[PDB]
Amino acid sequence: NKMDRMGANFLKVVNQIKTRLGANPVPLQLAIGAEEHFTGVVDLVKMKAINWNDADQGVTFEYEDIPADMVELANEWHQNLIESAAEASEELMEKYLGGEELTEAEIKGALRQRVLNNEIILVTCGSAFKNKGVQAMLDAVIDYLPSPVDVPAINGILDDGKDTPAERHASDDEPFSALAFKIATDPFVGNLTFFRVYSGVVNSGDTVLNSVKAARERFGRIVQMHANKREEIKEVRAGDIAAAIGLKDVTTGDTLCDPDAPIILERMEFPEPVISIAVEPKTKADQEKMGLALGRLAKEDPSFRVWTDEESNQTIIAGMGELHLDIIVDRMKREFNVEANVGKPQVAYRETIRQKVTDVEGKHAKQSGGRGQYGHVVIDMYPLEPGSNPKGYEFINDIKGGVIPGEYIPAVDKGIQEQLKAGPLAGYPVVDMGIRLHFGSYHDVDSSELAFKLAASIAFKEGFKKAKLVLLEPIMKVEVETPEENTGDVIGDLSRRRGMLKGQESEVTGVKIHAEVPLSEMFGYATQLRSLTKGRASYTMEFLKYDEAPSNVAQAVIEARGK
Amino acid sequence: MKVRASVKKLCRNCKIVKRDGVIRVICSAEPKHKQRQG
Amino acid sequence: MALNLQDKQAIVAEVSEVAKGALSAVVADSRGVTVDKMTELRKAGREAGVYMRVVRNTLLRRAVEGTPFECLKDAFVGPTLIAYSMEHPGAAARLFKEFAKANAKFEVKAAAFEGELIPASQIDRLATLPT
Amino acid sequence: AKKVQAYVKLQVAAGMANPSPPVGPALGQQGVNIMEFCKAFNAKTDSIEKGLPIPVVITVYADRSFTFVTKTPPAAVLLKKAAGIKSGSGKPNKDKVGKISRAQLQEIAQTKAADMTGADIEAMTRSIEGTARSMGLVVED
RNA sequence: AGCCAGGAUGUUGGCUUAGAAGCAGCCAUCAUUUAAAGAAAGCGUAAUAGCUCACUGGUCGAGUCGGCCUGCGCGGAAGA
Numbered sequence: 001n002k003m004d005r006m007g008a009n010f011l012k013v014v015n016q017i018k019t020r021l022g023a024n025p026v027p028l029q030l031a032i033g034a035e036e037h038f039t040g041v042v043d044l045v046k047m048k049a050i051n052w053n054d055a056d057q058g059v060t061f062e063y064e065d066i067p068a069d070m071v072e073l074a075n076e077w078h079q080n081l082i083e084s085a086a087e088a089s090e091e092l093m094e095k096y097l098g099g100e101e102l103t104e105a106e107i108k109g110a111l112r113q114r115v116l117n118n119e120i121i122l123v124t125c126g127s128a129f130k131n132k133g134v135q136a137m138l139d140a141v142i143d144y145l146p147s148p149v150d151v152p153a154i155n156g157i158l159d160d161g162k163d164t165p166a167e168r169h170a171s172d173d174e175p176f177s178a179l180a181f182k183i184a185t186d187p188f189v190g191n192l193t194f195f196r197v198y199s200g201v202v203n204s205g206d207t208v209l210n211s212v213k214a215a216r217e218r219f220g221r222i223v224q225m226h227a228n229k230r231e232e233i234k235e236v237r238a239g240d241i242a243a244a245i246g247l248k249d250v251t252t253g254d255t256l257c258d259p260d261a262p263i264i265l266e267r268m269e270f271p272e273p274v275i276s277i278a279v280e281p282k283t284k285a286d287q288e289k290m291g292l293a294l295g296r297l298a299k300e301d302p303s304f305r306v307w308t309d310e311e312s313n314q315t316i317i318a319g320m321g322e323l324h325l326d327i328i329v330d331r332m333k334r335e336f337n338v339e340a341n342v343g344k345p346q347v348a349y350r351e352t353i354r355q356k357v358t359d360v361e362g363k364h365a366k367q368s369g370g371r372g373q374y375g376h377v378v379i380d381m382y383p384l385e386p387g388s389n390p391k392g393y394e395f396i397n398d399i400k401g402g403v404i405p406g407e408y409i410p411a412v413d414k415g416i417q418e419q420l421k422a423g424p425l426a427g428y429p430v431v432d433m434g435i436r437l438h439f440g441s442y443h444d445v446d447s448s449e450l451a452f453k454l455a456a457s458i459a460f461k462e463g464f465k466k467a468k469l470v471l472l473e474p475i476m477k478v479e480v481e482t483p484e485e486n487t488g489d490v491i492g493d494l495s496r497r498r499g500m501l502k503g504q505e506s507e508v509t510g511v512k513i514h515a516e517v518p519l520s521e522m523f524g525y526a527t528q529l530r531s532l533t534k535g536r537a538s539y540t541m542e543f544l545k546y547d548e549a550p551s552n553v554a555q556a557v558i559e560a561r562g563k
Numbered sequence: 564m565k566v567r568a569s570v571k572k573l574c575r576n577c578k579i580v581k582r583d584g585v586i587r588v589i590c591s592a593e594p595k596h597k598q599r600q601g
Numbered sequence: 602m603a604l605n606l607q608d609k610q611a612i613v614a615e616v617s618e619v620a621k622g623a624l625s626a627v628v629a630d631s632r633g634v635t636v637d638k639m640t641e642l643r644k645a646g647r648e649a650g651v652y653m654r655v656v657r658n659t660l661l662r663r664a665v666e667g668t669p670f671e672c673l674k675d676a677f678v679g680p681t682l683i684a685y686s687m688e689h690p691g692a693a694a695r696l697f698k699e700f701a702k703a704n705a706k707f708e709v710k711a712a713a714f715e716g717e718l719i720p721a722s723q724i725d726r727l728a729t730l731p732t
Numbered sequence: 733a734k735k736v737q738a739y740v741k742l743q744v745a746a747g748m749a750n751p752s753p754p755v756g757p758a759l760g761q762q763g764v765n766i767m768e769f770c771k772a773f774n775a776k777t778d779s780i781e782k783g784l785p786i787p788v789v790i791t792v793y794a795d796r797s798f799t800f801v802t803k804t805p806p807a808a809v810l811l812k813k814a815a816g817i818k819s820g821s822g823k824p825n826k827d828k829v830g831k832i833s834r835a836q837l838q839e840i841a842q843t844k845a846a847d848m849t850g851a852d853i854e855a856m857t858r859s860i861e862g863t864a865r866s867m868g869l870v871v872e873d
Numbered sequence: 874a875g876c877c878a879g880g881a882u883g884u885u886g887g888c889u890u891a892g893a894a895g896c897a898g899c900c901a902u903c904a905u906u907u908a909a910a911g912a913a914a915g916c917g918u919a920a921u922a923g924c925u926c927a928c929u930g931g932u933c934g935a936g937u938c939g940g941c942c943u944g945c946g947c948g949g950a951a952g953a
């Protein structure tokens with residue numbers, strides 16, 4: 001398209017297609033003239049130049065005699081078209097090498113065959129803005145693109161798979177099968193399910209089985225579509241794309257069919273969101289309405305997910321881009337109206353001891369005569385190492401001096417959990433603490449456990465202050481691919497940030513870079529990456545082990561509340 | 564450019580030229596070393 | 602530091618080693634490689650000897666003044682870069698072989714490796730006896 | 733055709749072949765994979781450095797294979813395994829920068845005189861002597 | 874001054890050891906290997922390739938290079 005725009009060259013675009021994408025392309029319609037004097041196109045089969053008329057809006061055109069300005073390159077590419085079409089069967093090539101010109105019908109059929117097996121792509125030229133080329137591309141859609149029964153049938157699995165479970169020829173007689181490719185939002189009914197009937201017939205009011213989830217759905221209003229507009233139709237035949245009102249539970253990519261039809265279809269894969277944002281409405285108490293809006297927009301779109309992380313109150317918004325994610329917020333402002341501003345996510349820190357070990361203890365004068373008991377514990381805090389266990393709590397029982405009563409000796413580890421689980425420093429959990437009980441004191445009458453847990457807590461507190469332990473940031477394993485020309489820029493950007501690097505690896509179609517970066521930094525990293533790489537890079541997060549980092553924010557989150 | 568009253572050669576590729584009497588610094592490496600008047 | 606006294610001295614200090622030992626070499630400055638040429642001049646210093654003065658102060662006038670006392674063909678201008686590798690045990694030794702083998706590979710060019718011959722009339726190498 | 737062609741000093745000296753993970757992702761230009769990482773180096777990484785530093789030249793070839801006359805056993809490893817103290821510069825004016833004696837020099841001379849040679853076998857011995865002595869501290873012998 | 878070009882293959886340095894790269898931090902380390910090797914010049918400095926700190930050989934025919942003092946000038950120097 002845009003053959004009218006300056007710099008236009010059909011040949012260069014064809015060569016770019018061959019060199020970059022990988023397909024070998026056969027020209028179908030060349031172009032007469034330069035960008036401004038784009039009269040029309042010349043087909044390489046009928047040998048006619050369909051110059052379009054400027055006065056009317058492309059509806060009419062006039063056929064000419066393909067002038068001598070391009071009568072040699074045209075013949076050359078026409079011959080290349082013949083030769084390329086002849087690579088469909090030996091009967092074509094044998095007559096082609098026999099010196100006789102093949103008839104147009106067999107050329108078109110052989111091309112349709114080559115498009116069907118996807119060996120070649122047929123390239124047509126034209127400019128929609130200049131009202132030219134569109135009729136010829138639609139014509140080549142009729143002549144070359146495949147109809148539903150112009151390929152073999154779709155396959156599936158039945159009862160955990162079979163040799164040939166389903167080969168459903170698209171017909172009006174076989175039992176109903178379909179796929180719900182798209183879900184849309186209607187404020188007046190609450191859903192809009194787009195489906196393509198691969199093989200079968202279904203009608204208004206007919207019940208269906210959602211094979212994957214094994215449940216019943218009634219088709220209330222099957223309709224056909226003209227963009228936003230909807231037109232009621234009584235029935236949908238096989239091979240037709242329609243929208244189903246009255247579906248309330250079907251996720252994108254779920255097969256909808258009558259019973260005894262293929263349970264699972266191939267449409268089982270979706271991408272992973274790269275951009276993660278937080279959002280919070282101006283009035284904080286619109287949270288239920290916002291949550292409902294997010295839940296609907298997440299059920300319709302499988303690549304947009306909303307999970308409310310339970311460490312904080314923030315709602316986490318994941319998406320494919322900053323555009324994507326802000327269209328998902330102004331759309332909320334306009335339909336299902338809520339006003340919400342996006343921001344940054346908060347910080348999930350942890351802690352590790354800075355290689356300090358002692359034998360600290362705690363003691364409260366709980367006796368006072370009347371109370372009747374008291375508790376004391378001698379503990380020994382130590383770290384193990386940053387990242388050897390999944391269970392950070394390590395406890396090797398060793399109680400020797402003052403051995404406590406024998407019914408809850410191993411039960412003096414779960415009581416320590418309520419300090420390690422959350423919040424000792426600034427409301428952030430701790431990892432790797434090891435306790436090792438050697439001494440203490442008690443009296444074997446009724447040694448109160450809940451007030452013995454106070455001694456352990458004050459012991460942990462004292463150990464913390466004398467330890468001078470430091471904060472641990474979250475750092476993940478990003479992996480990026482890019483062409484071997486932007487390696488310098490990507491590695492420079494990670495180096496500008498406080499990012500480590502790991503792997504000098506080069507693929508065959510690029511390079512896989514591996515880097516360890518913080519989580520408080522690199523907010524909106526994907527969009528910056530696309531900017532500095534010409535939108536040709538992806539990444540992933542593997543949530544690897546935390547690493548130490550010099551942070552001026554690590555203490556600012558606890559000196560905000562002081563002591 | 565720079566119209567500072569004290570032009571100097573900030574790097575090695577700067578040259579001192581005296582076009583129109585005015586003493587100028589012209590740098591054939593990076594244009595941030597272009598000054599006007601001695 | 603190619604001053605007048607240092608040149609007048611090093612001219613004789615480099616003519617002496619080639620008038621007491623074997624012929625010397627010369628290697629131009631066209632295209633040297635990082636290891637292909639550096640380790641070739643390494644092997645040259647290895648086989649030829651550890652006393653060769655691979656430096657070059659072979660100006661035409663300095664040569665005609667200093668070196669031309671004996672074997673006056675050296676006085677002829679050496680219009681190329683020069684790396685001198687003499688040879689201890691006889692004439693036309695491993696150094697001459699390395700120079701002749703460097704004129705076509707493993708160096709820029711060896712300026713045909715003409716060398717110094719006491720007779721100065723034998724174009725052929727010192728293999729006169731057919732045997 | 734062209735020897736090596738990519739000269740990047742981003743490879744852990746000896747030890748595990750192709751130790752990219754420690755070396756860092758900043759020299760990704762080179763096209764090394766699991767094919768050229770265990771062809772020749774895997775079978776001749778024994779008599780050079782058994783627990784010591786021996787940098788290796790890849791010598792990648794444009795002939796669609798990888799093989800060349802690889803470098804002989806390093807002197808960096810000779811003077812780090814015959815010494816005991818593997819220290820050096822950085823803390824060379826404060827404590828031991830490693831040991832260097834005539835025994836390590838003779839070892840490297842009789843060992844690294846295959847391919848890592850210079851203007852003499854004794855000249856590569858002086859190379860090992862410089863690589864052992866100029867660390868900042870040398871044993872007295 | 875102008876032109877024909879050459880600086881490691883013990884050397885991810887023996888290295889702040891996850892190298893920070895024959896020219897990041899860095900310690901110092903001619904490191905024979907020399908028309909050259911400084912473990913540091915702008916390119917990628919985190920790195921190759923191809924121009925190259927520095928340095929010289931070959932060309933090429935009379936002056937050249939920087940400082941110090943002094944005279945007289947130049948810019949700094951825009952108002953009703």
Ligand SMILES: [Mg+2]
Nearest residue numbers: 946947948949
């Ligand atoms: Mg003045």
Ligand SMILES: [Mg+2]
Nearest residue numbers: 947948949950
């Ligand atoms: Mg003035």
Ligand SMILES: [Mg+2]
Nearest residue numbers: 566949950951
């Ligand atoms: Mg003014």
Ligand SMILES: [Zn+2]
Nearest residue numbers: 574577590596
């Ligand atoms: Zn400048």
